[PDB]
Amino acid sequence: GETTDGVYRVMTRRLLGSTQVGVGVMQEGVFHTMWHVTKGAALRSGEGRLDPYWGDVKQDLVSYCGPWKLDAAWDGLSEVQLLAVPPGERAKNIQTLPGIFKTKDGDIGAVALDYPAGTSGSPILDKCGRVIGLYGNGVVIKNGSYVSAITQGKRE
């Protein structure tokens, strides 16, 4: 169906009303979302059908119709913008300076912005509007609040 570039809402008619399970990004004819949102399942867009192409549980990422296209990354210095698409609410750009997830395999970016779990899959933008990662997978700190990572896949 519609394959126009941009940010999309991932919805389900399986429960009471139309619940928003997550968010995704269309770019070069590929739907990019977090695995925990769709569980690898096929989606629908009008009468059209989106079938998965790649996915990985550890990375928590899954791409539809083609391989992962998003390849930009945070420079570790500049402020970023979470283009947050919350359930029942309009898309909103929220500027923040990222944190750090120090792991044994390497340091990753982080965003200390707390949104309803249905916002999972919202893009994180650099000063050019290039997608550098997805919000929705992170950790709960001693504060009780959520700190998500800037999740980005590989382009081949």
Ligand X SMILES: COc1cc(Cc2ccnc(N3CCNCC3)c2)nc(N2CCNCC2)n1
Q: What are the catalytic residues?
A: 36, 60, 120
Out of another protein, ligand X, none, what residue 24 binds, judged by CB under 5 to 8 A for its kind, is: another protein
Which entry of another protein, ligand X, none binds 136, CB below 5 to 8 A by partner kind?
ligand X
Stretch that binds ligand X, among 10-18, 71-79, 121-129, 136-144 (CB under 6 A): 136-144
x-or-dash pattern for ligand X, window 27-46, by CB under 6 A? Answer: ---------x----------
Q: Which of 55, 98, 123, 136 contacts ligand X by CB under 6 A?
A: 136
69 forms part of the interface with another protein (CB under 8 A): no
Name beta bridge partners: 109: 100
47 lies in the binding site for another protein (CB under 8 A): no
Report the largest interatomic distance among the alpha carbons of the chain, rounded to a whole angstrom: 46
* Single-letter amino acid, residue 61: L
Return d(Cα 38, Cα 132) in angstroms, integer: 21
| DSSP reduced 3-state for 35 | helix
CB 152 within 8 A of CB 144: no
Report which secondary-structure segment, H or E, holds 27.
strand 19-27
Number of residues that bind another protein (CB under 8 A): 68
Q: Contact at 8 Å (CB) between 61 and 151? A: yes
Q: How many residues does the chain have?
A: 156
Alpha carbon distance 116, 107 (integer Å): 26
- Segment interacting with ligand X, rule: CB under 6 A, options 4-12, 39-47, 83-91, 112-120: 112-120
- The binding site for another protein (CB under 8 A) comprises 2, 4-13, 21, 23-25, 27, 31, 35-36, 38, 41-45, 50, 57-60, 79, 81, 83, 85, 90-105, 110-113, 123, 125-129, 131, 137-141, 147, 149
